[PDB]
Design a protein around this ligand. Structure first.
Ligand code: NDP
Ligand code: NDP
Lengths: 222, 223
């Protein structure tokens, strides 16, 4: 049996990924929401598929991160595949029009949060078999793609997590970890369920660390 | 007549850049220190070259950044060449080993600081002739270079600011701004603060196109 950790599973790509993993046999899923009590569809999935364990996590909240290791541990001794999917996208457009608060909130939720979350959960991941570590990033975070769009604090947060993900891939190569940053697509437009089907196949198959990948398995430049 | 603005001019490259400009014919220089009152080299520099103006700036401190345009406005109608030089470099090595505060301090000092600084001085830069914007970055900030080192919060912060620098260049291109990310070199191969300064002042004056990521010598770096 394999255990997957997905942050931000209450909706979007995250929910579709949990819904996709719940169908697979022998996949325990630790699914997080800021507010489980309100996570109607996730909770109904967990009611039907007890493979699916729901836990609270606010990745902006250090006090929430300080508890995620012990709380995930109640449901599993190990994590095979870790997915940092929870993230905000609330700041686009020009630098001069981006208030301080937006830079900060993208930093805390999109950069420090995934990093702290990986720090807290690394031990559980070390004790797993797959040792796979995915940060759901964006093609917007690329330092070398031009979309002729301003991504402001959003893109800046994804470039930052990209930089530290590539560094992490190097640090955990000797421990036989697979680390990737993955663009889940434009949800050309695709549905969250399409994204999750592609993402899930990618999680399964990827067998080399340090990749910046799109959902379809092709590579993006950092 | 040109106004240069330089953050962190009390020591390091920043002092060496201000020292060189203060010898330059018809150049006014707003130089910043966290603590003007103990920036004794720079106070003597401005005493001996009063074209040099010393104002308080803590780029980690939003209250300090909220005052910079008024502080700068005391001495000048405009900024021709803006240099975000002030910055920290306190955290390297593995992710698992980088505590929360190092990631936080490098974001606030090395990313938000320069963004808020530029937001505050853009009206004065807009009013100037040269419209030249330099963020002192690092080669460690590249997403496409491998020095066989991890740079932790430091590298992340330079990469972060690098992303926004590139965006700012796109955004201000039609306002005829020249925006550049510039690696000043590894300063005391090792080079001297005065060598860095000399090469930077040369780049500051000759740089004609925007959106570039440059080393001190004027070679391009990959984003
Ligand atoms: N959709 C797209 O086109 C693209 C998306 N992405 C990436 O895809 C991932 C998910 O996107 P998508 O499903 O569309 O996003 P949604 O906005 O649909 O949902 C985001 C998820 O993140 C959770 N989340 C947000 N803030 C926090 C927080 N502080 N603590 C914990 N959980 C939080 C949300 O919970 P809550 O309901 O509580 O807000 C939700 O579960 C992200 O990593 C994003 O960066 C990037 C490229 C393109
Ligand atoms: N120099 C190098 O070899 C390399 C460094 N860089 C870049 O070059 C820049 C210049 O380096 P250098 O001047 O020698 O740096 P130093 O290491 O000597 O010190 C940092 C400088 O920034 C100031 N400073 C630090 N923190 C703050 C703050 N919170 N608010 C305001 N000012 C602050 C310091 O003033 P104070 O005395 O008060 O601390 C000092 O002038 C760096 O800041 C960095 O971005 C990048 C690549 C290589």
């Amino acid at each position: 049996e394999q255990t997957y950790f997905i942050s931000g599973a209450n909706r979007g790509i995250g929910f579709s990924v949990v819904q996709r993993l719940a169908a697979k046999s022998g996949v325990k899923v630790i699914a997080t929401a800021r507010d489980p009590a309100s996570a109607t569809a996730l909770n109904e999935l967990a009611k039907e598929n007890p493979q699916v364990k729901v836990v609270q996590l606010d990745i902006s909240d250090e006090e929430s991160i300080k508890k995620i290791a012990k709380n995930v541990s109640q449901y599993t001794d190990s994590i095979d595949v870790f997915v940092s999917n929870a993230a905000i996208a609330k700041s686009f457009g020009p630098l001069l029009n981006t208030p301080r608060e937006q830079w900060i909130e993208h930093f805390f939720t999109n950069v420090l949060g995934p990093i702290r979350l990986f720090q807290e959960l690394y031990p559980l991941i070390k004790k797993g078999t797959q040792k796979k570590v995915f940060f759901i990033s964006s093609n917007a975070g690329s330092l070398n793609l031009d979309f002729g769009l301003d991504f402001s604090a959003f893109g800046q947060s994804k470039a930052a997590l990209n930089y530290s993900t590539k560094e992490l891939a190097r640090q955990l190569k000797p421990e036989n970890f697979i680390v990737a940053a993955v663009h889940p697509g434009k949800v050309t437009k695709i549905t969250p369920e399409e994204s999750a089907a592609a993402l899930c196949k990618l999680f399964e198959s990827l067998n080399t660390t340090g990749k910046y990948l799109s959902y379809d398995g092709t590579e993006l430049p950092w």
